[PDB]
Design a protein around this nucleic acid. Structure first.
Ligand SMILES: Cc1c(N2C[C@@H]3CCCN[C@@H]3C2)c(F)cc2c(=O)c(C(=O)O)cn(C3CC3)c12
Ligand SMILES: Cc1c(N2C[C@@H]3CCCN[C@@H]3C2)c(F)cc2c(=O)c(C(=O)O)cn(C3CC3)c12
Ligand SMILES: [Mg+2]
Ligand SMILES: [Mg+2]
Ligand SMILES: [Mg+2]
Ligand SMILES: [Mg+2]
Lengths: 247, 487, 487, 245
DNA sequence: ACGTGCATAGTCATTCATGA
DNA sequence: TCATGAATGACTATGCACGT
């Protein structure tokens, strides 16, 4: 199985890869034009393609199907993945065996993730079941040591850890430039994105798994559905314990 | 590669979104009635010195300062938020003094960032009054480089005054604006009757706050919806514009609309009537002409046919257009980091509590500072009494460290105080200058006693809020705009 | 209503536009090689403290500061100008240190203002070096609120180094960038041979400035065009990229392009080749693949057919693509408010003249300040010599003025000096501090002697420019990038 | 009489008066200024057509390309008259065409581009004195107690300042004299009381004396021949100040 | 279906001179 | 016709909850 990549019938925003093998190909679904631009530059153009998404994705749970199919961003995703939707879904025509969702570490990136995951679960569920969907974890900090190579941190804890270790090791940091804190993918350059989210030898990916389909169906409908009351009560009920889901 | 279940991811991510939107974006803090973007814009302008005592700064500078230090978001929407706070038809009491084209109540958009200038209004200066005296908790900004205020002093009830509208997740708020003088009376009562229960307090406050006071004037019809909002936190308030029937030389009649209800777009309103007359659902209307201008204000002339009754057409307009429209009140605000629907007495009380907190904290700040000044002054006075020895000591010292260590031993003084003696100028050794130090000590000790007295007396604390608020209202309070009528 | 003839209106209005564009927009000042927007952006960042000794500020803050104080134009285009000055493929020696996505040599646009941060580069700090020491004339800004510099100190030849391109009215400029080390040698010669005529100077400078040095590396073919540019002020310099033929194991041969000439868009270049294969105008080419990355840089692989000669295809590429392209040099710059096409010797000389002016003005400023401090120090020493008397006098004074007036009488002192004595802290009455005052007087008088010597000797002045520039080049100078070859 | 929109440009904020003889079209530089003008105008007799960006040079550009330009189409359509040989002054929808641009050089440039469009496509509009130029204010004097005054030149500013101080009036040294750098910085009220109020506005009527001489000047300044324009500027820019002495 | 307000920018067309 | 580089921003689409 092999499929042609665009080079001078696919989305205009798509920066496709060169490899014609889906098994080896990857699609990075990116939040924002800036981040997508940097990703297009820092990627490995052989196996990695970039599809920047602009603005909040349409909620396929709330909006009727005809309106969803008219949405330019949804069309781009469906077209880029190559597979159909719902009953016309054919995994054989999947153009990328790795679909990496890359959003900002901030709160709005989390929201876009849920909107994208909702699109996938409702229109192209088998992509989730067969583990073709991943979540890229962007860096939060960049430690710029005076003499040593810079280190990236993906949490406040890791920042504190790498800071302590380096200082203990006799390294030093400026208290001015110091630790750069990322507030979004758009603030990163090509190199930074490669060395934290796209280089397969250092990137931190999370594979989206689907255990209970019925339970998932209910949760999607509650959180993303038209019923506000259900969503309100669910949030007030479970937000109190969001910290303790993995304890 | 780590595995993660879709349910865990969805739940965690969406809750994180909902909560921050609820608490940190779409909904107002009950104490100052501000959303984060509002608070950050105002403080940015404040810290930048963009105040009414200086000329308008380019609004781009306010946006950029807000972006770079406090609000990690886009310049575009931040400008929109700044612009809104400058529109007299949006805010009942504008917090931004805009210079240039800030749009109109119609479809005329505001000018771009490059064209406009902006500074804080005098009332916005009361929002930030004495913010630098530890009157409110500060926290580090989004990257820890600088501090930002968690809440503003808000020396007038801004939430109730300017209202607030916001769409969050799972909930939304829609608080109407109110007349400052009426709110003040409510606060004055709350201060006097500080022990009154909620039942009594609600009755009193509802008597003084007659209802919302919209910047667009207009009319409020009925009293139930207003009462519902204040008692329940939800109510439907019927609004109306103002219509004045005019007769012509020929003897033709025309309806002149000079006011519209809150948040009704003038252009959309005219267009709606125009579209409702072609298809033909508002017969009796002969012609629609917008005779509005910057000099006469809103003036929509509706010429009606000879075989048409004025009130019939007006009633049809009330029915089929936003000439009559309801304000869906929902008194939702963030209280102690939690979203809560509040009664009117709760809104007043929580604000009064905030004011008392501000005044006590200000007093504490001033008291601490007064003691520090007094402490150093006491040191200087000791030096003056033994000035001959002090100077001789400093001179005979090989360094300033030898001189300092000696001064402590000489006069039995702290290191901070001894430091002050060293920092003393030869100016302060003049006769009259020596005297001012003495008197200043006497002056401050009186101030310290006063400040201590305030902290010890809840009566004075309440009195200060009353007197200071009264001063603000006398200066910045205005007449009611929205007229309240019965059914 | 006043009548006006169309010819009068057209002539006046268009000339007014042309002149301001010529002198105050599109063309560079010869002394610092900067256009108004460049100069204003850099000074705005400088005054704001956006320097290499501090973390990158949000670029929005630089734009807003430039817009609000110096550059009365749009935020959009100002950001574009700032961004460009940060791109290593645009400026041979970038003046802005950018943090974030500033685009690529291809069609990848820069990130929006909200995403990027920016500060001045170390070399840009040399552009502004000692600007606060009256080294350049300042004028009121566009509204008279603040002062702005007419020209920067420019402690390295920025015009020739970074070049300049601009479209004005009736004329346009296109100065290529050059290697800083080569320019320095030219300046060093100009300083040593300060009396040399234009003929000798042109010969000397042309020998040291071997040709343009583009940030995009590549090749310069031939020497005629370069010579023309330096001798005439106009010349066509033939540029080429770098091509390396690779042979696959028993496979077809392919051309690897790793460099392109100045200002050639990578994406447009690839597209041009691709489209010229379609209708078929570059036969012999089998496949085009962009193997470029952030880690290997530019790498365009052009596999050619087996029945095709590599050298033939490369010449076809030279012919029908910008793999070979000419730089149309037109050495136009503003000299004393007048647009002028300059020889290379004139460009160097005018720059050297500017440097000498800066150093002389700096020296004069420092001499004036040195005298003022010395003047005050002389007062302090008089006070120390009669310290016992100084104190007793101040004590008996009803005011500080009586104390002051006495000091004048006691020690024969100015009003400034007596005031300085008055402002003196008890800190400085310690032994080592009294000695420090003495030594400080001795130091300044020594510095004054040095400064006076500089002003009296043009030799030293030239020496200062040489030594200071040399220090800059040693630190910030780099290797040549563009290779110069013969026909 | 002609119908007003309530088949014309979308950007056009037409007037209410159906009489062209009484109607006026303010051709404005920028959306901001046009927006403020639309509000401060007298909607009865004054219509607003905001123009965005530099107008296309009809002297340089090919005819077909000019007709594709949205801004040119807006002008031609709004004026109602045809162009060139199909010009019919009878269908002129506004007998007063006021060009209102910023006082800055780019405003001057836009004026020349518009005057070029008019002179080449719709010359009779100039010949019959239907074309005017609005002179925007440069300064606004904000007296502490008295009504604010507007100035249209540096000299007038100095004069009004001098007169006021002599009369015992006073100004803030902070707020003080506001300097306008463009129409976009003005609000509706300010524009009315300086450029649109017919009882105080300073308009200049464009007159056409020698058509042949004008034709040559337009071709020199606006044409494709750069050398001619270059030499003309270097020749005459030296004496631009002394054209009215 | 529309308004609300704080969140998630690229595209579009000219002046102007010059050389392909 | 195109690139060049400083000059002269509106329009376009979603989330989110609620009431006509
Ligand atoms: C109007 C404008 C543009 N439009 C003008 C044209 C005629 C009207 C229909 N729209 C097209 C496109 C444009 F394409 C780009 C910019 C800018 O890039 C820009 C900028 O600041 O960079 C500023 N403006 C506006 C002030 C004029 C721009
Ligand atoms: C993307 C975006 C918008 N759209 C353009 C694109 C059209 C095709 C795909 N959908 C998007 C959505 C938009 F209409 C407004 C804004 C803004 O007003 C705005 C703002 O800052 O106010 C910012 N953005 C971008 C960051 C996402 C906006
Ligand atoms: Mg983000
Ligand atoms: Mg927007
Ligand atoms: Mg632009
Ligand atoms: Mg302008």
């Amino acid at each position: 199985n092999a499929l042609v990549r665009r080079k001078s019938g696919l989305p205009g925003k798509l920066a496709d890869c060169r490899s014609t093998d889906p098994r080896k190909s990857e699609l990075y679904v990116v939040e924002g034009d800036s981040a997508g631009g940097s990703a297009k530059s820092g990627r490995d153009s052989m196996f990695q393609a970039i599809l920047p998404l602009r603005g909040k994705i349409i909620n396929v749970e709330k909006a009727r199907i005809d309106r969803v199919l008219k949405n330019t961003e949804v069309q781009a995703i469906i077209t880029a993945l190559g597979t159909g939707i719902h009953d016309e879904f054919d995994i054989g025509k999947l153009r990328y065996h790795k679909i990496v969702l890359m959003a900002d570490a901030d709160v709005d990136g989390q929201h876009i993730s849920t909107l994208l995951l909702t699109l996938l679960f409702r229109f192209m569920r088998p992509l989730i079941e067969n583990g073709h969907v991943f979540l890229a974890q962007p860096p939060l900090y960049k430690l710029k040591w005076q003499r040593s190579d810079p280190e990236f941190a993906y949490s406040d804890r890791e920042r504190d850890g790498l800071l302590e270790a380096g200082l203990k090791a006799g390294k030093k940091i400026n208290k001015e430039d110091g630790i750069q804190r990322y507030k979004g993918l758009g603030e990163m350059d090509a190199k930074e994105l490669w060395e934290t989210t796209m280089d397969p030898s250092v990137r931190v990916l999370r594979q989206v798994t689907l255990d209970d389909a019925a339970a998932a169906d209910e949760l999607f409908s509650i959180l993303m559905g038209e019923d506000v009351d259900a969503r309100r009560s669910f949030i007030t009920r479970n937000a109190k314990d969001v910290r303790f889901l993995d304890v | 590669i780590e595995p993660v279940d879709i349910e865990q991811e969805m739940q965690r991510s969406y809750i994180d979104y909902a909560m921050s939107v609820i608490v940190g974006r779409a909904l107002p803090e009950v104490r100052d009635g501000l959303k984060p973007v509002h608070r950050r814009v105002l403080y940015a302008m404040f810290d930048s010195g963009f105040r009414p005592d200086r000329s308008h700064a380019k609004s781009a500078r306010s946006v950029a300062e807000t972006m770079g230090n406090y609000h990690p978001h886009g310049d575009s929407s931040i400008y929109d938020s700044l612009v809104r706070m400058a529109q007299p038809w949006s805010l009942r009491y504008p917090l931004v003094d805009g210079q240039g084209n800030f749009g109109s109540p119609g479809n005329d958009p505001p000018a771009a960032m490059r064209y406009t200038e902006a500074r804080l209004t005098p009332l916005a200066m009361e929002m930030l009054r004495e913010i630098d005296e530890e009157t409110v908790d500060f926290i580090p900004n989004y990257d820890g480089r600088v501090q930002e205020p968690t809440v503003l002093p808000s020396r007038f009830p801004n939430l109730l005054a300017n209202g607030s509208g916001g769409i969050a997740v799972g909930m939304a708020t829609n608080i109407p604006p109110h007349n400052l003088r009426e709110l003040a009376d409510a606060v004055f009562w709350a201060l006097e009757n500080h022990d009154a229960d909620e039942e009594e307090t609600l009755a009193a406050v509802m008597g003084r706050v007659k209802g919302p006071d919209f910047p667009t004037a207009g009319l409020i019809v009925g009293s139930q919806g207003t009462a519902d909002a204040y008692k329940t936190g939800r109510g439907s308030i019927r609004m109306r514009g103002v219509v004045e029937v005019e007769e012509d030389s020929r003897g033709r009649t025309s309806l002149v609309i000079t006011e519209l209800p809150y948040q009704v777009n003038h252009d959309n309103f005219i267009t709606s009537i125009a579209e409702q007359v072609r298809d033909g659902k508002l017969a009796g209307i002969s012609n629609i002409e917008d005779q509005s201008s910057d000099r006469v204000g809103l003036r929509i002339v509706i010429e009606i046919k000879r075989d048409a009754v004025a009130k019939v057409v007006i009633n049809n307009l009330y029915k089929h257009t936003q000439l009559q429209t309801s304000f869906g009140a929902n008194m939702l605000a963030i209280v102690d980091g939690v979203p809560r629907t509040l009664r009117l007495d709760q809104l007043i009380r929580y604000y009064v509590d905030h004011q008392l907190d501000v005044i006590v904290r200000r007093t504490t700040y001033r008291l601490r500072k007064a003691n520090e000044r007094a402490h150093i002054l006491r040191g200087l006075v000791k030096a003056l009494d033994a000035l001959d020895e002090v100077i001789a000591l400093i001179r005979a010292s090989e360094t300033v460290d030898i001189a300092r260590a000696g001064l402590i031993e000489l006069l039995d003084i702290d290191e901070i105080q001894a430091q002050a003696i060293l920092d003393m100028q030869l100016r302060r050794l003049a006769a009259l200058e020596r005297q001012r130090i003495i008197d200043d000590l006497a002056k401050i000790e009186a101030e310290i006693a006063d400040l201590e007295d305030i902290l010890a007396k809840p009566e004075r604390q309440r009195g200060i809020v009353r007197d200071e608020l009264a001063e603000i209202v006398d200066r910045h309070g205005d007449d009611r705009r929205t007229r309240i009528i019965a059914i």
